[PDB]
From TrEMBL, chain A:
Source organism of this protein record: Human cytomegalovirus
Gene Ontology molecular-function annotations: structural molecule activity
Alphabetical list of InterPro entries matching this protein: Herpes_capsid_2 (IPR002690)
This protein's UniProt keywords: Capsid protein, Host nucleus, Virion
A Pfam cross-reference name: Herpes_V23
Name of the protein in its database record: Capsid triplex subunit 2
GO cellular component, as recorded: viral capsid
TrEMBL record, chain B:
Gene from which this protein is expressed: UL86
Superkingdom of source: Viruses
The protein's name in its UniProt record: Major capsid protein
Source species of the chain: Human cytomegalovirus (HHV-5)
TrEMBL record, chain C:
Keyword tags: Capsid protein, Host nucleus, Virion
UniProt name for this protein: Capsid triplex subunit 1
Gene name, Swiss-Prot/TrEMBL: UL46
GO molecular function: DNA binding
Matches recorded under HAMAP family: HSV_TRX1
Protein source organism: Human cytomegalovirus (HHV-5)
Keyword Oxidoreductase found: no
Annotated TM spans: none
A GO CC annotation given for this chain: viral capsid
Length: 289, 49, 290
């Protein structure tokens, strides 16, 4: 009997050096749009979604619901991808920048370097270019998403010197043997649209929460049976030291601007490490999805 | 490999590949052959002792 | 493609001969290695072998206890495999009788180094701990070699003995009078945010409630002093940054009928614990509640 795999063909001609480059990635993480059983080679990675006017956060949105998989065997005309299941252990290659340890929570993350890159030696075709999302530990993914959101929140006033100091000292991350730096979301003083939507919704839920809760605890101060509401509005009286249709639209806007932030305020851990092989390029991670 | 007790560092299953090569080293000893002896060898003269 | 090969019945994974057996049998050789019955074959549990120094393996030679790693700002000994009982010495939940009992038995370097590495802020003290699972076997050397389990049950080899989970008496916490048919176990961390001090409490919750919002409802019902201390700390010291006042995560599930009180014997110190005999470890991500 065989195993429930995904066959993958290659429409372009393959050479022996390209297959020899491909067989380095035996147990590598690969994303897939929908789990069919015969896919073309234009659906192996994120190069179908690499775009100019859209950037990182759109790729994070597409990756969080992408159905990832693992390669199993490379041969002529067919690439056997294995769909991992919840609750089995799988060898996974470390194509990322950082070594892992025993017990790190591991999650997918798109590559920070685009198509224009000097350091990549990957599977390259006439137009098609295989890319591969790294798997970093979840503290690094939280730190990268958080620092990128903060230095994208200053995408409007880069004229000043102190904000240039803030971004250029926020352009880098500090991890285990990692002087790794992340590139700027601002490119030539115009911002990619979805990053703008993310920080706009952040400031919008902040301003809505800081404006309407005082009126609502004014309306709530008559049902006081628990010891929480009085200090809840003591906070609001400490900070300073209406038509119904507008507040209805304000509250619906509050919940929808929150609901558009689920990709940023949470994300699920994908793999987790059972052990690390010597020389730290492989690990046998139990899937958790 | 040699087996040791439990917990001690054991040995991974190990193979190896070694390829030798071959060196070039041609030799030569040239020599000359005299013109009088060659004209007496390759050409035939008259009947003299 | 035929009807005998497409609609074939699914096999029993121990019924056919082993791959090593048929591989030796196709050439018909003899080797002193016995081959006919492989051990650890039909183990649904997932084994994991982890190194540990000798300074943390006391009260661990008994089979069955938790295993929690911490992060440290240093580079080379960066991760340290604390057991469950050693997390209680910093915990202000257990009584001073039991804390001055087991404080006098962890006299080592790395144990007190771990206690000194729970010294920093609480919001990062959430981030330092991540659950590694349970442990069944030891080896009792200078560097003893554990066999960690992460998913599935917890048993001795050849399935002849089911191993249990050991949790100490003051961490044990039931939020009901009548148990259900099943109950999942949990790891509840709370922070009594008082004025000067910030030293937390560790709990294990054997609740029968499945859905997580219906568990944080009972958690907010039974930890009102902790959230009140959290908001007292938020008012009394502004311009600071407190967060994650109560932390919860899954640890598995028992069968809700094998829970009774037993005792530990190690260095002639009796530690009263409750057990969970037919236990399976099934972990989850670290959630929280405010």
């Amino acid at each position: 009997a065989m195993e429930a795999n995904i066959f993958c063909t290659f429409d372009h001609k393959l050479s022996i050096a390209d297959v020899g480059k491909l067989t380095k990635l035996v147990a590598a993480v690969v994303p897939i749009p929908q789990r069919l059983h015969l896919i073309k080679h234009y659906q192996l990675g994120l190069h179908q979604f690499v775009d100019h006017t859209r950037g990182y956060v759109r790729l994070r949105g597409l990756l969080r619901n992408m159905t990832l998989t693992l390669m199993r065997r490379v041969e002529g005309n067919q690439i056997l991808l294995h769909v991992p299941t919840h609750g089995l252990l799988y060898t996974v290659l470390n194509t990322g920048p950082v070594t892992w340890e025993k017990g790190d929570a591991l999650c997918v993350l798109p590559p920070l370097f685009h198509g224009p890159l000097a350091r990549e030696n990957l599977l390259t075709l006439g137009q098609w270019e295989l890319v591969l999302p790294w798997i970093v530990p979840m503290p690094l993914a939280l730190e990268i998403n958080q620092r990128l959101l903060i230095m994208g929140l200053f995408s409007l006033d880069r004229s000043y010197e102190e904000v240039k100091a803030a971004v250029q000292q926020l352009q880098t991350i500090t991890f285990r043997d990692a002087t790794f730096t992340i590139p700027d979301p601002v490119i030539d003083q115009h911002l990619l649209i979805d990053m703008k939507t993310a920080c706009l919704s952040m400031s919008m839920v902040a301003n809505l929460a800081s404006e309407l809760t005082m009126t609502y605890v004014r309306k709530l101060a008559l049902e006081d049976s628990s010891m929480l509401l009085v200090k809840c509005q003591e906070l609001l009286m400490r900070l300073d030291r209406v038509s119904p249709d507008d507040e209805i639209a304000r509250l619906s806007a509050l919940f929808v601007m929150l609901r558009q932030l689920d990709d940023l305020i949470r994300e699920q851990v994908v793999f987790t490490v059972c052990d690390v092989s010597p020389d730290n390029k492989s690990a046998t991670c139990i899937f958790k999805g | 490999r040699v087996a040791s007790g439990a917990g001690l560092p054991t040995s991974r299953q190990t193979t190896i590949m070694v390829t030798k090569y071959s060196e070039k080293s041609p030799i030569t000893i040239p020599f000359e052959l005299s013109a009088a002896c060659l004209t007496y060898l390759r050409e035939t003269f008259e009947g003299t002792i | 493609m035929d009807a005998r090969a497409v609609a074939k019945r699914p096999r029993d994974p121990a019924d056919e001969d082993n791959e090593l057996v048929t591989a030796l049998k196709a050439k018909r050789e003899v080797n002193t290695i016995s081959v006919r019955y492989l051990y650890h074959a039909d183990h649904q549990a997932l084994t994991a072998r982890f190194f540990v120094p000798e300074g943390l393996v006391e009260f661990e030679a008994q089979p069955g206890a938790l295993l929690i790693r911490m992060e440290t700002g240093c580079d080379s000994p960066r991760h340290l495999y604390i057991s469950l009982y050693l997390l209680g010495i910093r915990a202000s939940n257990v009584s001073a009788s039991t804390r001055c009992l087991l404080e006098s038995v962890y006299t080592a370097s790395a144990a007190r180094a771990a206690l000194q590495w729970l010294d920093l802020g609480p919001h990062l003290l959430h981030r330092r701990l991540e659950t590694l699972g349970c442990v069944k076997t030891v080896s009792l050397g200078i560097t003893s070699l554990l066999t960690c389990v992460m998913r599935g049950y917890l048993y001795n080899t050849l399935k002849t003995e089911v191993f249990a989970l050991m949790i100490p008496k003051d961490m044990y916490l039931t939020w009901e009078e009548t148990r259900g048919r099943l109950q999942y176990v949990y790891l509840i961390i709370v922070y009594d945010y008082d004025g000067p001090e910030t030293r937390p409490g560790i709990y294990v919750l054997t609740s029968s409630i499945a859905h997580w919002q219906t568990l944080v409802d009972v958690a907010r019902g039974k930890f009102a002093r902790e959230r009140c201390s959290f908001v007292n700390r938020r008012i009394t010291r502004p311009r600071q940054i407190p967060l994650c006042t109560g932390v919860i995560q899954k640890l598995g599930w028992c069968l809700a009928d094998d829970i009774h009180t037993s005792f530990l014997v190690h260095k002639e110190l009796k530690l009263s614990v409750v057990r969970l005999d037919n236990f399976s470890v099934e972990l989850g991500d670290f959630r929280e509640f405010v």
